[PDB]
Design an enzyme around this catalytic site. Structure first.
Site, PDB file in Angstrom:
ATOM      1  N   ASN D  29       0.804  -1.179   0.000  1.00 40.29           N
ATOM      2  CA  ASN D  29       0.000   0.000   0.000  1.00 40.29           C
ATOM      3  C   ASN D  29       0.863   1.267   0.000  1.00 40.29           C
ATOM      4  O   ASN D  29       0.753   2.103  -0.877  1.00 40.29           O
ATOM      5  CB  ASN D  29      -0.948   0.020   1.205  1.00 40.29           C
ATOM      6  CG  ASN D  29      -1.879   1.151   1.105  1.00 40.29           C
ATOM      7  OD1 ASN D  29      -1.582   2.234   1.586  1.00 40.29           O
ATOM      8  ND2 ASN D  29      -2.969   0.956   0.387  1.00 40.29           N
ATOM      9  N   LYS D  63      -0.114   9.031   1.490  1.00 43.97           N
ATOM     10  CA  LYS D  63      -1.541   8.776   1.624  1.00 43.97           C
ATOM     11  C   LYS D  63      -2.179  10.144   1.922  1.00 43.97           C
ATOM     12  O   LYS D  63      -2.094  10.678   3.041  1.00 43.97           O
ATOM     13  CB  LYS D  63      -1.856   7.721   2.693  1.00 43.97           C
ATOM     14  CG  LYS D  63      -1.003   6.403   2.535  1.00 43.97           C
ATOM     15  CD  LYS D  63      -1.444   5.261   3.485  1.00 43.97           C
ATOM     16  CE  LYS D  63      -1.196   5.504   5.021  1.00 43.97           C
ATOM     17  NZ  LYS D  63      -0.281   4.585   5.864  1.00 43.97           N
ATOM     18  N   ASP D 242      -4.744   0.091   5.300  1.00 50.20           N
ATOM     19  CA  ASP D 242      -5.549  -0.860   4.522  1.00 50.20           C
ATOM     20  C   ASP D 242      -5.036  -2.278   4.755  1.00 50.20           C
ATOM     21  O   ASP D 242      -5.134  -3.157   3.899  1.00 50.20           O
ATOM     22  CB  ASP D 242      -5.474  -0.526   3.021  1.00 50.20           C
ATOM     23  CG  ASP D 242      -6.599  -1.193   2.199  1.00 50.20           C
ATOM     24  OD1 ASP D 242      -7.783  -0.764   2.309  1.00 50.20           O
ATOM     25  OD2 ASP D 242      -6.284  -2.144   1.432  1.00 50.20           O
TER      26      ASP D 242
END
Lengths: 275, 275, 275, 275
Positions: D29, D63, D242
């Site tokens: 991720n 992110k 996640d």
């Protein structure tokens, strides 16, 4: 997690199960005429006999939930049973049809091999009871409005009425207004919630279009399921109901040859334990 | 666009219509006992008589679609009718209840003022026919799975069977899995699609929670509708079905006083023609 | 449950809160021209001044998310600010507009009274930060894809960046493909999740149609909310964006007179404690 | 209907297309640390090199859309690029990462092989422009809130900006609140709407769970698609974002061996013309 054990429900010689070769529950939407039922049944028998695919012939004797009263509904029970009878004697086929009232369950069970509980009726307890009492194999249409985790309650209701011969059938879920989506995750969910009851996939009604039958059938089969449920017609456009989703009958063979190749691979894959 | 004309459906003296003062169709979920039905009916009569709100008492004699077979379903038809009979003679109330099979329609029509077609059954043509044939006022529960534009077909099916006394009832629409949303635009859509049939709003089942009854009732009433449909109980938590959405019976008055004030204003607003 | 306390966010003299008279955040979609902005602003000022409704003028200086690159986007920042400046000096109006990048936040904050975070951008943390840092009142568009319980995280992100002046704006939720529904229960949910932050309702974008503006506005207002967000145009069909939902400007008065009457009643209702 | 022609988008030597062997766009991720990126990349290279599967390494350097401001976001651009650089020199890998602002597009394009447009940002025209201008291969995340028929507008916007190197990525669609469903019919729809642009499937984000990665990947692959997009971690539970959907890294091989076998069959099936 561990691979769970899958239940086998026999339709005569046919072992229906999530980890067995897929069984085809297929035919036409409604028993439009004896000749049409004979032509359609014969083609399916010939093709499935050739490909080596287990087969149960489907047709409705009544359409109980159309939008107009004067609108064509089928031959009704008496005359529908006569056609099923001729199909069985002629072709040696197993038969599935839907029942719509408590009083229809036993007389239809007396003729056919699998009785089907319609989606809109799937929570009607007295109907489940009457259907359970025949001892017939059951196919339950999963309501468009029901979450896949809730199918255990259906299986359990039949079991309480003494019937452990339940097959569950995916036919799409509400996606906003007037569209359905098939949640491919729902297959796994139902296999778990039902303690491994066979799950089949009604590709035709999920498409409520027919061009996409192939692609959607392959996606559902890819999840490892006990069967496919398909309606077809020589000229879908002139089908007396749900023509717009019906597979053209002439395409049955290339379609099924692909399904078989796909299923055979899928059924060969080891379980992967992911936690 | 022009304001359309709204149809009046009479439940005795009560003119039910989208542009009339709202009518309350309300009571309890199921006829748990005679005493409870008497206590609940009396409170509703007293409160509605005081506030000047038209009133029709609701309760089910059977719960036909629970999730288990052994699970409590009500007193059944024979004994339920006896309780409705006593409610009518004692209190002078109009009664609404739901019917679940063709054979129930006339015997229940013989007792009650409005017969209700359950949501899951609303497309069953033979049931619509049997219900149409009684000549009774009908309340049709709009399926969770049906778009509001499709309610015309329901009204039309009744009309073809000779019955023009149909009221449509909003009870939410599927919103993903296991949740419902009420589309406030659907009220207008149904008024149009039904050529102005009365639309009522089942706030209680739309909440499938009860804390939000007030807010949701006001939103639906604000769109100009023919009535509200509400279930209540002295202690919702101990209600034998759907307790989690039932209004606490003691709150009926402050709730209805607000509904009346709101409806009275709403019903006073001129139509605005926006093109 | 107890009625909770509602936060007041001041846009100058205007106290914006869920339990105060509703504030109108309204104007046009995009700053099509200076003359059009002047004509539209003047009508809104005249009408709101007459009816006694708090008012903040809305228009976008850029449409950052159209479907084609060559497609009309507005006058841009420099020239848009000039028009806002003239509107403020001429009419004494408070102004709200949307910002699309971090670098736009302070220069627009230097001119307008409320800066708006677009729905698609509402989780972009660096944008929230840049917007928080201006100390301006914020309006956050609730994403179509976000559950109402999740609005607390948005308010909290602003608070962590030192800004407690957040107003949340309902603009519909995904309902299948290419349709939106407004969940009227979401208002209560957001009031709770945000500890009583003001919630306003963008009726115009919820309709992504305009005929239904009235009915949907009344439903949302009926839940007790801090304001309405509306776009209008003299001839919606020729609006350079989102014409199909824009209220016809000539209908503003009869519409707002009804909103005011409705809000005034709603705001007068006691809380009912239902457990 | 006829089988349409599918566009090839080259990521160096790798021909990415709907009717070619599937390409794996996969990694982790977020770039949690250099060592973790090196360990994960090495395993993927080893496994894909062994199985003969085309491969592009994925990780985010930022992110940008978490729910808290103080919450971990990645190493940022400068340091993320350094890690991509080392991965490229060490392993000879192609790299994909996402960009979040116009100013990030060229500097990241200078390092990586494919730049990714996040779902929430996919309609931001200035970002599309800036990304188009780099001449880099693009991966566009299909918004949860967008119908599959609308992907043509995205491809077209890039084309107008001079960039014909667009790959579209399925990552689920809103299904009520806080759940996503993957519409398997959407693959065909996008292939048509995009004139045969490569479509890949982000199985990991579609699961917003990880146990079901296998079943969902097989369903999407079964529709004939250009690739799979997967995030993994040695211990998903400790992944910094996640984690709950991430594939356990140790299961990559048995998973990919199955994907390859499945894809190879699927890609061998003739088109069936159903009208």
């Amino acid at each position: 997690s561990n691979a769970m054990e899958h239940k086998i429900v026999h339709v005569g010689d046919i072992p229906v199960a999530n980890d067995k070769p897929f069984t085809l529950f297929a035919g036409m939407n409604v028993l439009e005429s004896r000749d049409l039922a004979m032509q359609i049944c014969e083609h399916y028998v010939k093709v499935t006999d050739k490909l080596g695919i287990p087969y149960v012939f489907k047709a409705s004797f009544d359409k109980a939930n159309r939008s107009s009263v004067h609108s064509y509904r089928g031959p009704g029970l008496e005359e529908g049973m006569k056609i099923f009878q001729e199909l069985k004697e002629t072709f040696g086929v197993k038969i599935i049809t839907d029942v719509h009232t408590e009083a229809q369950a036993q007389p239809v069970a007396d003729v056919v091999d699998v009785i089907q509980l319609p989606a809109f009726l799937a929570r009607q307890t007295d109907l489940v009871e009457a259907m359970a009492k025949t001892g017939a194999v059951i196919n339950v249409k999963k309501p468009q409005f029901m979450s896949p985790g809730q199918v255990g309650n259906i299986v359990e209701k039949f079991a309480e009425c003494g019937n452990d011969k339940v097959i569950l059938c995916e036919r799409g879920s509400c996606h906003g207004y007037d569209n359905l989506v098939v949640d491919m995750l729902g297959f796994g969910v139902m296999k778990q919630a039902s303690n491994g009851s066979p799950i089949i996939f009604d590709v035709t009604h999920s498409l409520q279009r027919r061009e996409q039958t192939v692609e959607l059938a392959k996606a559902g089969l890819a999840t490892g399921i006990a069967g496919l449920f398909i309606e077809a017609h020589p000229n879908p456009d002139k089908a007396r109901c749900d023509g717009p989703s019906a597979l053209p009958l002439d395409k049955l063979e290339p379609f099924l040859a692909q399904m078989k190749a796909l299923d055979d691979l899928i059924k060969s894959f080891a379980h992967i334990d992911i936690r």
